[PDB]
Amino acid sequence: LYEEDYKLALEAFKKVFNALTHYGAKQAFRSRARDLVEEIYNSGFIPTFFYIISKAELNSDSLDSLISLFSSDNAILRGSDENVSYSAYLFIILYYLIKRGIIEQKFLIQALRCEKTRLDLIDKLYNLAPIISAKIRTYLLAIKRLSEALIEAR
Amino acid sequence: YEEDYKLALEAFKKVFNALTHYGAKQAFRSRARDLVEEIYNSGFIPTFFYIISKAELNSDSLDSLISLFSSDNAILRGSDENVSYSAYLFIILYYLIKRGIIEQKFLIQALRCEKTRLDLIDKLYNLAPIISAKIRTYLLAIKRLSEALIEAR
Amino acid sequence: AIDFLVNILELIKEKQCNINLFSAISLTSIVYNNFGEFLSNNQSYSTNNPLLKYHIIILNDKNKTKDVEEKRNIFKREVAELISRNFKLDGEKVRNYFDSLKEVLKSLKYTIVDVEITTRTRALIGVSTSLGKLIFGSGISFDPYMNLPYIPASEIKGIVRSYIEGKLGEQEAEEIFGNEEREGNVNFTDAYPTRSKDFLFVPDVITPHYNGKKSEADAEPRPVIHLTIAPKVTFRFLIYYKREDVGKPICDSMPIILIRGLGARSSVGYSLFELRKIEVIKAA
Amino acid sequence: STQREYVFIPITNSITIDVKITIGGSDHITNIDERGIHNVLVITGYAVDEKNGRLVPTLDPCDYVKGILVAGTPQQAQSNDFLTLKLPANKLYLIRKKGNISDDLKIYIPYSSPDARNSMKTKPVSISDDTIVNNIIKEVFDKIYNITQKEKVKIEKVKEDIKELFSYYALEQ
Amino acid sequence: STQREYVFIPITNSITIDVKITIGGSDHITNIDERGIHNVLVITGYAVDEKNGRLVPTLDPCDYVKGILVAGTPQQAQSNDFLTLKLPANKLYLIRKKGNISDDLKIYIPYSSPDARNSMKTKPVSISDDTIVNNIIKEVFDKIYNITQKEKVKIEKVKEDIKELFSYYALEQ
Amino acid sequence: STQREYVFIPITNSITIDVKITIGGSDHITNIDERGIHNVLVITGYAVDEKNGRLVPTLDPCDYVKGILVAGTPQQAQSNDFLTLKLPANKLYLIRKKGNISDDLKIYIPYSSPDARNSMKTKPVSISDDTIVNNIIKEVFDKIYNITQKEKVKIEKVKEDIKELFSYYALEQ
Amino acid sequence: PYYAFAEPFFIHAITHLHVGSGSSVEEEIALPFQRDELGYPTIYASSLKGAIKSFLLKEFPDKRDVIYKVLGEDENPEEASLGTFLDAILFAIPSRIIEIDSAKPYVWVYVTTYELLKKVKLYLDSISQLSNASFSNLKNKIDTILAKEGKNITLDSDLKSAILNEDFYVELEALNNKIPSIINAGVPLLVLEDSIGREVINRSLIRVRRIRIDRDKKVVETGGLWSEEYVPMKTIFFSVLLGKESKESAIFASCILRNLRYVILGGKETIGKGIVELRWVKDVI
RNA sequence: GUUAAGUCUGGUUUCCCUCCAGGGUAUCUUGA
């Protein structure tokens, strides 16, 4: 079945919100939600996407936790309170790209964990730039509302 | 029937009382003046997210609502706009309760969990097409009431 | 394409005022954020691309990760210096823009106040703006179509109004710049750089040790290589109006506020300007 | 044209016996129309001496003095220590202009020698502490104008505007 | 707090004798703003005896009394036995509010004992016939007041407010 | 000021030769630079009189004639039925401007008396029938613009700039 | 000849430009630009007419009666205005570009799509029927272009590929230089397939985040931050100014519509926005 | 008195809209 942008945002934010045990992680995630949606317009989905992947500071226990979050209901993001927020926003964007079927899941989890695939992932993103950029900003606006509603300020 | 034009008076009386500072009144006026058109154009789930995002729900100010439900001397507490949005959230939830769209017990045990709040929002998402049609006249009544009973800031 | 990506830094250093700096930095950031990826698998790096340097330089042999994480900071500093020395100012298009616009406004019966101001100390404007934010975390107010940094007209007007209402009362201020129930009587345009001495962008750093720290026990430097605006860069902007009255408080305020700040970090003396020239063309 | 005298308004009061014409001619240019002071004037680059109120030329452009531009001529025991100008009313730097001006004036500013014996260190001097503004109306508006307490019930308005509109820089030395 | 003698506005001529201090202190509450009479007070459930007007209290909300709340004393002599109060100045229902609420007022009112002689049936008195209105202006609005018929280029424009702001009730005995 | 006479552009033929200086000088208003005809003039309030077409003057602002400006003289056998006048070029209702013409021009306009024997019921007219375009080019343009058929390979541009660009309201009696 | 005159013009933004649609709950930006029904920027003819009429009523005070008759009385309306504006449809919008292998270096390029040209052709085809004014030159150029529909092309330069708005890699094909000058400038003009040009254009407007400073703290007020979409400088909007038969219509279209060149559209007039040049197709195509 | 080696850190946090305008004027049986 096809879930719309707001239903998808609810389903994702529910997985995320229940994985950031530390509350500082929650508030940092909120501050990411509020500004990355505008950064993506101003700079582009691809630059900002890889900027998120870098700020997430992956390649740790912070990666299998992410790939388990796709189906664990117990997976717990861990790391600095600024790394977990970016890793959660990365999960948000990957959840969109996967549920919308824009990109395969296993291809994404492969392009994340090592380098040879990251470049062809860049190429794939440049191919699907209009497919993605058409409608992701509404999903991210939904996430922004959910975040700045369900979380208190820092 | 036109009992929505009466439920509107009930909820508006409760709000009007609970906005003890006149700035909150003059602000809720504008919220009622805008969000009905927003629900007409954009739909219910977009505008509901835009309302809950600016209402600033928290156990403190969400208690100022659960008390407002039953009690009569509650006082919505917060900034002017911060409460002009929670008063409107109260309007909405009050209609959804007094119309049995959602069960008051299921709501009160969700306005507190900090966890089943997302589940309240999802439950609402399932009923969006129904609510979008049911609440139209109620919200138009609330808009008229606010325009009349409250003078412009 | 990734071909456009690998070949971006030579584009920067070989176009130097005719590459779109916004897009250029936004694309350089994909290389910067994927460093250990572009440095693997016998890439299609030419013998002049600025990236195979890091295949030579060896900063750490014990660890493959730490080598890359050090090369990445080296590369960030190198990109700052690249943008700084290659992208320089050609201000003929800005002179054309401003003189044409001045003729336009003379054709609309406005009184114009052309104002040239010169940067004294390394300035920052729009630090939370997005230009280098994906690399440096600190942007610069940039105009991706004039391809030049600028000072927003709203910012100049707001600073001027804060001054005027500081010295003439918040009621005469509202008489000049209007209020929520009336229109303003003065209009400002953005300030674009017209002439530099040698550079336009210059690197800088900010290393907080004890910002939001509890004790000497968690202090740790966190350096922030960003880009600022060179000294001696000259910005000009117009100020037009209809009733000449509002031209009196713009006369005196302007040479007084510029010697204070006009951008960010001015409490540590950064965004300091000086009124290079002013000129009124009355058209009553 | 007509002569015009500039009554500076710092917190001090040294303005009692200075002018040959107190109520002026037919009218001043400064008004009191229940909206506070109108057509009040600003003078930049000069500071006032809190003792023997006199505008001194201190070339710093941040220095300013706001006062009232009245009708009159200073007592003719003067003109050796004042400045005198004919200005076309567009050179004036007014505030809250609520009318029209003769478009060529005769202004009289209380001048001072720049005192090249001690340096000129100025200091911003605002106006607050009602006991200092209580008597501004009792000194420089009941003599300068007659409207004081014949139809004025909005005294609080001009009080608050004096408390906020009029500021200046004084040499404090 | 501060004292308040509320005058009644009759068609009669006896209101000059309730107080010798017709001004009060430094303030008149009911103003003259060239838009009419502002800061006016009206009280419900009352009436006015036609002889020596004093508010015979009743239980009728539709009844009212349309008068002028003067700032000051009832000369300490009158209203020493009548309905007098001290209010937080908000429960003081001022109509056409155009000023600062003094945040507390001690009000004096012309009160008449409930007049237990007859069943008091109301009679609406609607001021017209401007001789009463050309009279009230000289009786009080120059004796009570101090800002009318001196500068007033408009004498009858402020006199015509009485037509459509003070139409009280009577009992006509 | 120089001489620039106004030859119109009808669908008629009786206005083949009406200028005494065909080649003129460099001072020609209407030009062609492969983007088409430029600086076409238009006169509103004048209707054509195709039988030896002299622009009949009427008062209807809706009646216009679009012809081109060419340097030349009125043949010295004229000025008894032309309108000759000196405009500052701030009155030249020029269609398709190309270059900012300087100032202070002197125009010779074909003119006629109203001749009120009949009554004016002017009707719109336009140019078609490409053989008529051939004639209007040969007998007017080439006799003025020998430039065409010298350095031009695209006759179709000027051919189409008469189909659309030129119209007029003939007298049609 | 339903209309006495049809004056299609081009709107050139001299400065950045902001006509607003007001905030809605589905935009991420507080103050967004006006939008077509397709999503492209536009200028509702309400805004066009209001701005132009308010300007004319001050520039030509003596022709005020003619202005009123043709563009509608303000107070006490007793007739229908003769004039008619159509929605200004986006002709071409700047778009910052990165390309390798181009002789001339470009920092930005003009961009349009095929549905926009179809809207322009619809406007021109529709007004040539409702009036005695056909424009066989714009129509010719626009169909010359439109014949190439279904493939990204280029008019005024030789780019074989680029990256538009730092997110969209496009592969172009040059159009023969027989195409005349449309914009009448020196910048290339890409014409993208609409499913790409849609993104490339709606991500080509400037979003300027502004703030509101607290006085005594000299810091940002709370809730004092928002964004605004402007449209780049030198953007071109195509519109038409139709007018029904009358005598005031003639004086309008011959006296007013000529001495008119510069107007102020939109809001934000006091931060240097809104200045616009109207180039008439009849005059300078 | 000498030998050699540098190491660590590599942006965070707030603010995401506030106020007014929410429609006005004109038109409202004829035969049987």
Query: Do residue A149 and residue B118 have CB atoms under 8 angstroms apart?
Result: no
Spacing of C44 CA from H30 C1' in Å: 105
The set of strand H positions with any atom below 7 Å of a protein CB reads 7-25
**What does the block give as tokens for C171?**
């009621």
d(CA F146, CA F162): 17
Q: Which helix (H) or strand (E) holds E155?
A: none
Number of C-beta neighbours around residue B47 at 10 A: 24
d(CA F50, CA F58): 15
Instruction: Please give the single-letter amino acid code of residue D107.
Output: I
Number of domains, chain A: 1
| Experimental approach taken | cryo-EM
Query: Do residue B42 and residue G223 have CB atoms under 8 angstroms apart?
Result: no
Question: CA F41: distance to chain centroid?
Answer: 7
Domain that holds residue A106: 5-148
Q: Which helix (H) or strand (E) holds C193?
A: strand C192-195
Give Cα separations from C262 to C117, D62, D97 (angstroms).
11, 17, 30
Q: Is G132 on the interface with F (CB under 8 A)?
A: yes
G26 neighbourhood in chain B, CB within 8 Å: 42, 46
**What does the block give as tokens for D15?**
């303005």
The dihedral through the CA atoms of C29, C32, C35, C40 has a sign that is: positive
Rg (CA), chain G: 20
In a domain, A47, yes or no: yes
Contacts of B3 (CB under 8 A, 6+ apart): none
d(CA F169, CA F60): 11
Terminal Cα distance for chain A, rounded: 38
Most distant CA atoms of chain D, gap in Å: 49
Give Cα separations from F97 to C19, D41, F32, F36, G279 (angstroms).
36, 51, 11, 11, 11
C187 with G266: CB under 8 angstroms?
no
Q: Is G61 on the interface with B (CB under 8 A)?
A: no
Q: Which residue of G has its CA nearest to F38?
A: G283
Most distant CA atoms of chain A, gap in Å: 40
d(CA E49, CA E15): 13
Nearest to E4 by CA among E82, E118, E115, E62: E82
What residues form DSSP beta bridges with D42?
D66
d(CA A150, CA B57): 7
**What does the block give as tokens for D40?**
């009040």
Q: Neighbouring chains of G at 3+ CB pairs within 8 Å? A: A, B, C, F
What residues form DSSP beta bridges with G5?
G243
d(CA B33, CA E59): 40
Question: CA C217: distance to chain centroid?
Answer: 36
A132 with A103: CB under 8 angstroms?
no
**What does the block give as tokens for C251?**
């006369």
**What does the block give as tokens for B65?**
């609502």
Q: Is A150 on the interface with B (CB under 8 A)?
A: yes
Number of C-beta neighbours around residue D144 at 10 A: 24
In a domain, A42, yes or no: yes
The dihedral through the CA atoms of C191, C194, C195, C196 has a sign that is: positive
**What does the block give as tokens for G280?**
């008439």
Task: List the CATH number of the domain containing B66.
Answer: 1.10.520.30
Nearest to E6 by CA among E131, E126, E93: E93
C36 neighbourhood in chain A, CB within 8 Å: 115
Give Cα separations from B139 to B13, B33, B93 (angstroms).
14, 10, 12
Phi, psi of B140 (to 5 degrees): -65, -40
d(CA E88, CA B62): 33
Nearest to A70 by CA among A111, A20, A12: A12
G134 neighbourhood in chain F, CB within 8 Å: 164
Give Cα separations from A72 to A9, A80, A105, B56, C84 (angstroms).
18, 21, 15, 30, 48
Q: Which residue of B has its CA nearest to G222?
A: B79
Contacts of G78 (CB under 8 A, 6+ apart): none
Residue linked to tokens 């325009």: B147
**What does the block give as tokens for E42?**
């009206």
Phi, psi of B15 (to 5 degrees): -60, -60
Give Cα separations from G166 to A89, C4, G96 (angstroms).
22, 11, 8
* C220 nearest nt, CA–C1': H9
F157 with F107: CB under 8 angstroms?
no
Give Cα separations from C101 to F104, G11, G276 (angstroms).
28, 16, 11
Query: Count of alpha carbons within 13 Å of C68, Cβ hemisphere only?
Result: 14
Phi, psi of G105 (to 5 degrees): -90, 130
Angle (nearest 5°) at CA A10 between A9 and A11: 90
**What does the block give as tokens for D162?**
């004096």
d(CA D129, CA A13): 57
Phi, psi of G263 (to 5 degrees): -130, 170
F31 with F161: CB under 8 angstroms?
no
Residue C4: which of G96, G105, G163 has the nearest Cβ?
G163
Q: Which residue of G has its CA nearest to A122?
A: G167
G97 with G109: CB under 8 angstroms?
yes
Query: Do residue C147 and residue G270 have CB atoms under 8 angstroms apart?
Result: no
Spacing of F130 CA from H21 C1' in Å: 59
F19 with F71: CB under 8 angstroms?
no
Rg (CA), chain C: 23
Specify the 3-state DSSP secondary structure of F55: strand
Residue G251: which of F35, F61, F97 has the nearest Cβ?
F61
d(CA F168, CA F49): 11
Long-range contacts of F58-63 (CB under 8 A, 24+ apart): F58/F114, F58/F120, F58/F122, F60/F122, F60/G247, F61/G247, F61/G250, F61/G251, F61/G254, F62/F169, F62/G4, F62/G245, F62/G247, F62/G249, F62/G250, F63/F122, F63/F169
G24, G25, G29, G221: best to mutate for the B interface, most B CBs within 10 A: G25
C6 with A126: CB under 8 angstroms?
no
Query: What is the full DSSP assignment across C118-150?
Result: EE-S-B---SSSSSSTTTTS----EETTTTEE-
D108 with D82: CB under 8 angstroms?
yes
Phi, psi of C51 (to 5 degrees): -105, -30
Instruction: Please give the single-letter amino acid code of residue F83.
Output: L
Nearest to C80 by CA among C223, C263, C211: C223
B85 neighbourhood in chain A, CB within 8 Å: none
DSSP C214: -
Query: Do residue G223 and residue B81 have CB atoms under 8 angstroms apart?
Result: yes
d(CA C20, CA C143): 10
Q: Which residue of G has its CA nearest to F35?
A: G180
Give Cα separations from D14 to D7, D18, D77, D166, E130 (angstroms).
10, 9, 16, 16, 52
DSSP F67: E
DSSP G245: S
